[PDB]
Amino acid sequence: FDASNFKDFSSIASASSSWQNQSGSTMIIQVDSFGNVSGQYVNRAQGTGCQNSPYPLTGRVNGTFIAFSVGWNNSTENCNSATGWTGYAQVNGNNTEIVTSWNLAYEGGSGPAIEQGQDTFQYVPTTENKSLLK
Amino acid sequence: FDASNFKDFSSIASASSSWQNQSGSTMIIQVDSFGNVSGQYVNRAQGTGCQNSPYPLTGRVNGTFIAFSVGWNNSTENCNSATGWTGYAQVNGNNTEIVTSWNLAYEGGSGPAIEQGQDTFQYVPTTENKSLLKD
Secondary structure, three states: OOOOOOOOOHHOOOOOOEEEOOOOOOOOEEEEEOEEEEEEEEEOOOOOOOOOEEEEEEEEEEOOOEEEEEEOOOOOOOEEEEEEEEEEEEEEEEEEEEEEEEEEEEOOOOOEEEEEEEEEEEEEEOOOOOOOOO | OOHHHHOOOHHOOEEEEEEEEEEOOOEEEEOOOOOOOEOOOOOEOOOOOOOOOEEEEEEEEEEEEEEEEEEEEEEEEEEEEEEEEEEEEEEEEHHHHHHHHEEEEEEEEEEEEEEEEEEEEEOOOOOOOOOOOOO
């Protein structure tokens, strides 16, 4: 996968790809040839619960457009919320990024509320070792 | 719902349910015991592309909260865009509803753009027939 020449999600379909946003959160995703997205999301956004453990992520792609969803209970920590992100991939400065808007639905002070924000994910190329033993 | 603890486990561990929003769009969803949502969405929003054919949907649930996603290509019609909904289930007037905000990412005049909105889905009860041939 040439991240400097990403065309659409089929450039990255059929193998895993890793991503990191501006807040330190990471995700690893699988895009199949039918437009499905699976993956795992690790939240590290300052001030939030449910950090540093993987949460299942699902979604859908159409060309360069994507939408994906995370529920905030993985059996390690339950934050009783959900986030949906929607956006698109593009090549920016010889890497690829996914530009998104998100909604977080949660229990607020006076009842259920939806918080909005934006995340941009940068592609993270794999690192490689000879073997698992140092 | 505490009473759900005192029923058949298999029947309550998962959900199969239909929903209609205020625009007449429908979705059919399956929620499994692990939190995974699958289903099919049929758009009927007035004046839009990609109406009247089913589009895959996928999502996650946590408690009463839900997020789900649809890409707008099913090989019948491609609208080159994607929508993400986020919200929650609640009860009113003796029916369950899902209250959501959505984002739509699409190719606008100037390049990619995001449109925002709200949808509320009402639960739709199953119709039951004797057979495919007789009601």
